[PDB]
Scaffold this active site. Structure first.
Site, PDB file in Angstrom:
ATOM      1  N   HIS A 106       0.826  -1.204   0.000  1.00 42.29           N
ATOM      2  CA  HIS A 106       0.000   0.000   0.000  1.00 42.29           C
ATOM      3  C   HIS A 106       0.864   1.258   0.000  1.00 42.29           C
ATOM      4  CE1 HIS A 106       0.514  -1.131   4.334  1.00 42.29           C
ATOM      5  NE2 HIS A 106       0.889   0.134   4.392  1.00 42.29           N
ATOM      6  N   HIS A 134       6.910   7.281   5.189  1.00 44.74           N
ATOM      7  CA  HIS A 134       6.354   6.795   3.934  1.00 44.74           C
ATOM      8  C   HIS A 134       5.621   7.951   3.280  1.00 44.74           C
ATOM      9  CE1 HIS A 134       3.188   6.393   6.986  1.00 44.74           C
ATOM     10  NE2 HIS A 134       2.354   6.691   6.006  1.00 44.74           N
ATOM     11  N   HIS A 148       2.165   9.175   0.508  1.00 45.26           N
ATOM     12  CA  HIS A 148       0.956   8.883  -0.245  1.00 45.26           C
ATOM     13  C   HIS A 148       0.890   9.856  -1.407  1.00 45.26           C
ATOM     14  CE1 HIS A 148      -0.598   6.905   3.528  1.00 45.26           C
ATOM     15  NE2 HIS A 148       0.224   7.804   4.041  1.00 45.26           N
ATOM     16  N   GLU A 158      -3.189  13.555   1.718  1.00 42.45           N
ATOM     17  CA  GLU A 158      -4.322  13.070   2.497  1.00 42.45           C
ATOM     18  C   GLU A 158      -4.963  14.283   3.149  1.00 42.45           C
ATOM     19  OE1 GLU A 158      -2.665   9.642   4.864  1.00 42.45           O
ATOM     20  OE2 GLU A 158      -3.929   8.659   3.352  1.00 42.45           O
ATOM     21  N   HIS A 217       4.815  11.208   5.591  1.00 38.02           N
ATOM     22  CA  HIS A 217       4.477  10.951   6.981  1.00 38.02           C
ATOM     23  C   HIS A 217       5.666  10.345   7.721  1.00 38.02           C
ATOM     24  CE1 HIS A 217      -0.123  10.632   6.003  1.00 38.02           C
ATOM     25  NE2 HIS A 217       0.295  11.881   6.096  1.00 38.02           N
ATOM     26  N   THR A 254      -4.100   6.733   9.108  1.00 38.79           N
ATOM     27  CA  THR A 254      -4.955   6.868   7.936  1.00 38.79           C
ATOM     28  C   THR A 254      -5.078   5.589   7.125  1.00 38.79           C
ATOM     29  OG1 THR A 254      -3.198   7.710   6.492  1.00 38.79           O
ATOM     30  CG2 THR A 254      -4.451   9.332   7.778  1.00 38.79           C
TER      31      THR A 254
HETATM   32 ZN   LIG Z   1       0.688   7.858   5.980  1.00 35.72          ZN
END
Ligand SMILES: [Zn+2]
Length: 258
Positions: free
Chosen positions: A62, A92, A94, A104, A117, A196
């Site tokens: 993911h 990591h 997103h 996010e 993050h 999240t």
């Molecule tokens: Zn994250």
């Protein structure tokens, strides 16, 4: 068969396996800059990453995580709205399929190309596993990425992605300095939230920086070449691994600046 970001297992489906997804302090949220309250009580953030020891980068299906040695106070976060010492365990990102989406958290509904993050856990709780079971167990530093000039300190991460293209792949990743990912200013907003991604535990004290850090289109493009799937399986590009903004409900977002 499990959670993901596809149309059949996306964020809108998560509540079936993780009821807390409909909780009272879920993340991410939209940060309304005019409703955000300046709090003079908030102390400056204290980021001590000079002794940080990165160990490995891993594709966890993911997203990819860059793990650090957290057996000692080598890389820690203190101050701000925090009480105690929080140790960096990983970071990591997103990102989206297009430059107009990927983050996010949003600022006045504005979406950024990606969001970084940096996850830290409260040392009073011994270990990450115990920390996630507490309301003040984690302290995640969120940094927005916008497409523009390249970020030198990110290139090392970009160059190794080819070696961990599929889910399950990992590669040694030593001597990476996370200080190269920080913007010039440490001004921030903060609010109580959650993780999240499942299992979406509400154990997080979010510290979202106001200043984004620029990356080049070429660098972001390489993120989009990763795969959600494992080797030997049908290819699914790892893009749009972000959860939509959740209801703020009974929460107040505080700002360290005005
Ligand atoms: Zn994250």
């Amino acid at each position: 068969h499990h959670w993901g970001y596809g149309k059949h297992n996306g964020p809108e489906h998560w509540h079936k396996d993780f009821p807390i997804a409909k909780g009272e302090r879920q993340s991410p949220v939209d940060i309304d800059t005019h409703t955000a309250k300046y709090d003079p009580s908030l102390k400056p953030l204290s980021v001590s990453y000079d002794q940080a020891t990165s160990l490995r980068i891993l594709n966890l299906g993911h997203a990819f995580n860059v793990e650090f040695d957290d057996s000692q106070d080598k890389a820690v976060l203190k101050g701000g709205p925090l009480d105690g010492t929080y140790r960096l365990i990983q970071f990591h990102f997103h990102w989206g399929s297009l430059d107009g989406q990927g983050s996010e958290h949003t600022v006045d509904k504005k979406k950024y190309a990606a969001e970084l993050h940096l996850v830290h856990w409260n040392t009073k709780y011994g270990d990450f596993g115990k920390a996630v079971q507490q309301p003040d167990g984690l302290a995640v530093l969120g940094i927005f990425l916008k497409v523009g000039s390249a970020k030198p300190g990110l290139q090392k991460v970009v160059d190794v992605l080819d070696s961990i293209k599929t889910k399950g792949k990992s590669a040694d990743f030593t001597n990476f300095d996370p200080r190269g990912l920080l913007p010039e200013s440490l001004d921030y907003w903060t609010y109580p939230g959650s993780l999240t991604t499942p299992p979406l535990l509400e154990c997080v004290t979010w510290i979202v920086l106001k200043e984004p850090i620029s990356v080049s289109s070429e660098q972001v493009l390489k993120f989009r070449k990763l795969n959600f799937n494992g080797e030997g399986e049908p290819e699914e590009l790892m893009v749009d691994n972000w959860r939509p903004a959740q209801p703020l409900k009974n929460r107040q977002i505080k700002a360290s600046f005005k």
